[PDB]
Design a protein around this motif. Sequence first.
Motif, PDB file in Angstrom:
ATOM      1  N   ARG A   1      83.300 -17.991  16.373  1.00 26.64           N
ATOM      2  CA  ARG A   1      83.730 -19.100  17.220  1.00 26.64           C
ATOM      3  C   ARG A   1      84.851 -19.906  16.541  1.00 26.64           C
ATOM      4  N   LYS A   2      85.070 -19.676  15.253  1.00 26.04           N
ATOM      5  CA  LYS A   2      86.215 -20.284  14.549  1.00 26.04           C
ATOM      6  C   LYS A   2      87.478 -19.459  14.695  1.00 26.04           C
ATOM      7  N   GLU A   3      87.325 -18.139  14.746  1.00 25.51           N
ATOM      8  CA  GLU A   3      88.476 -17.236  14.784  1.00 25.51           C
ATOM      9  C   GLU A   3      88.925 -16.889  16.189  1.00 25.51           C
ATOM     10  N   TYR A   4      88.008 -16.986  17.156  1.00 21.81           N
ATOM     11  CA  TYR A   4      88.247 -16.525  18.530  1.00 21.81           C
ATOM     12  C   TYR A   4      87.616 -17.464  19.543  1.00 21.81           C
ATOM     13  N   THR A   5      88.068 -17.374  20.794  1.00 24.94           N
ATOM     14  CA  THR A   5      87.305 -17.937  21.905  1.00 24.94           C
ATOM     15  C   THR A   5      86.143 -16.962  22.173  1.00 24.94           C
ATOM     16  N   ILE A   6      84.904 -17.460  22.133  1.00 27.49           N
ATOM     17  CA  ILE A   6      83.706 -16.664  22.414  1.00 27.49           C
ATOM     18  C   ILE A   6      83.043 -17.122  23.717  1.00 27.49           C
ATOM     19  N   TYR A   7      82.662 -16.159  24.556  1.00 25.54           N
ATOM     20  CA  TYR A   7      82.022 -16.453  25.822  1.00 25.54           C
ATOM     21  C   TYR A   7      80.547 -15.968  25.817  1.00 25.54           C
ATOM     22  N   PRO A   8      79.639 -16.705  26.480  1.00 25.91           N
ATOM     23  CA  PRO A   8      79.945 -18.010  27.065  1.00 25.91           C
ATOM     24  C   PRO A   8      80.011 -19.086  25.973  1.00 25.91           C
ATOM     25  N   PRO A   9      80.325 -20.337  26.372  1.00 26.74           N
ATOM     26  CA  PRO A   9      80.307 -21.432  25.409  1.00 26.74           C
ATOM     27  C   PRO A   9      78.907 -21.543  24.819  1.00 26.74           C
ATOM     28  N   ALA A  10      78.820 -22.063  23.594  1.00 24.39           N
ATOM     29  CA  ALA A  10      77.545 -22.148  22.849  1.00 24.39           C
ATOM     30  C   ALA A  10      76.356 -22.738  23.623  1.00 24.39           C
ATOM     31  N   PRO A  11      76.559 -23.858  24.363  1.00 23.30           N
ATOM     32  CA  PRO A  11      75.420 -24.431  25.067  1.00 23.30           C
ATOM     33  C   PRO A  11      74.887 -23.571  26.209  1.00 23.30           C
ATOM     34  N   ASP A  12      75.672 -22.584  26.655  1.00 25.12           N
ATOM     35  CA  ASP A  12      75.291 -21.730  27.790  1.00 25.12           C
ATOM     36  C   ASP A  12      74.657 -20.383  27.418  1.00 25.12           C
ATOM     37  N   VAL A  13      74.723 -20.027  26.144  1.00 27.19           N
ATOM     38  CA  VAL A  13      74.292 -18.705  25.688  1.00 27.19           C
ATOM     39  C   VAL A  13      72.884 -18.364  26.160  1.00 27.19           C
ATOM     40  N   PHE A  14      71.961 -19.323  26.073  1.00 24.58           N
ATOM     41  CA  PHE A  14      70.599 -19.085  26.543  1.00 24.58           C
ATOM     42  C   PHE A  14      70.224 -19.594  27.939  1.00 24.58           C
ATOM     43  N   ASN A  15      71.188 -19.820  28.828  1.00 29.26           N
ATOM     44  CA  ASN A  15      70.827 -20.333  30.159  1.00 29.26           C
ATOM     45  C   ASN A  15      69.818 -19.526  30.983  1.00 29.26           C
ATOM     46  N   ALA A  16      69.855 -18.190  30.871  1.00 27.11           N
ATOM     47  CA  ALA A  16      68.865 -17.355  31.615  1.00 27.11           C
ATOM     48  C   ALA A  16      67.426 -17.713  31.236  1.00 27.11           C
ATOM     49  N   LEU A  17      67.168 -17.945  29.947  1.00 26.61           N
ATOM     50  CA  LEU A  17      65.803 -18.301  29.522  1.00 26.61           C
ATOM     51  C   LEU A  17      65.435 -19.734  29.963  1.00 26.61           C
ATOM     52  N   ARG A  18      66.411 -20.650  29.934  1.00 26.65           N
ATOM     53  CA  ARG A  18      66.153 -22.031  30.371  1.00 26.65           C
ATOM     54  C   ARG A  18      65.859 -22.102  31.845  1.00 26.65           C
ATOM     55  N   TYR A  19      66.639 -21.416  32.680  1.00 23.15           N
ATOM     56  CA  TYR A  19      66.401 -21.547  34.131  1.00 23.15           C
ATOM     57  C   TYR A  19      65.159 -20.783  34.588  1.00 23.15           C
ATOM     58  N   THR A  20      64.750 -19.780  33.812  1.00 26.03           N
ATOM     59  CA  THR A  20      63.603 -18.961  34.185  1.00 26.03           C
ATOM     60  C   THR A  20      62.662 -18.870  32.975  1.00 26.03           C
ATOM     61  N   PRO A  21      61.696 -19.800  32.849  1.00 30.18           N
ATOM     62  CA  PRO A  21      60.703 -19.720  31.760  1.00 30.18           C
ATOM     63  C   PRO A  21      59.932 -18.408  31.873  1.00 30.18           C
ATOM     64  N   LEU A  22      59.369 -17.951  30.755  1.00 29.44           N
ATOM     65  CA  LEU A  22      58.653 -16.676  30.717  1.00 29.44           C
ATOM     66  C   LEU A  22      57.567 -16.668  31.763  1.00 29.44           C
ATOM     67  N   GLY A  23      56.825 -17.784  31.860  1.00 33.75           N
ATOM     68  CA  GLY A  23      55.753 -17.883  32.854  1.00 33.75           C
ATOM     69  C   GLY A  23      56.217 -17.789  34.292  1.00 33.75           C
TER      70      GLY A  23
END
Lengths: 230, 4
Positions: A35-57
């Motif tokens: 993330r220092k050398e390149y633009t990385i996708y998605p942005p850091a706060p979004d990397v885990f959005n799938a787990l946040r919007y859909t809990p395991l349960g």
Amino acid sequence: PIIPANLPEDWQEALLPEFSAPYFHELTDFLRQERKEYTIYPPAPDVFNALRYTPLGEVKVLILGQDPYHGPNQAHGLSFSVRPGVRVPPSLRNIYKELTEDIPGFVAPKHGYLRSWAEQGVLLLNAVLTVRAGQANSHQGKGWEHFTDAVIKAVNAKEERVVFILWGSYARKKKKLITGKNHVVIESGHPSPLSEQYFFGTRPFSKTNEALEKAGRGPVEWQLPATVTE
Amino acid sequence: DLPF
């Protein structure tokens, strides 16, 4: 244990072995430097959005993608989905076309934002969760596959039926992980224009709902809102 | 600090 912010507790518990693994420490150092050398996708706060919007349960359906979109504004932590205001990419256009033919009354919206599916139990998981801008597969084999197989395994370990939707040759290799007696695998060719002939007419959305209805698990409401907010 |  390197634990990401704002994760559901059931994911924190299920995935603690990954978050504590030596390989994951190394992956964390690699991504810091990336993330220092390149633009990385998605942005850091979004990397885990799938787990946040859909809990395991809450997992009822799992739709596995390969890695994030690698153009500007596209990826936001969900397989297949793009942010509001972004052009619907080819694979998602084909998904909309199949939805239109599969789900009576489905109307494809102008936007490509699939948050409302994730909010009703559809885990939109990419096998690889980061990518360098403009270079597809650039983070392949750095640990994300180990991590997302652990997600798949944790979902498979649930007793209540989950429908795993596996599109294309890569996702179909995961079929061997789905050993749970109540689970269902829906498999076909990928919706990409390269292989769309093996995707069209497979009706994975009604089939997923039939499997869910049968199990008393609640069919998904595939219709997307006509306009959206992040 | 974290990249995710």
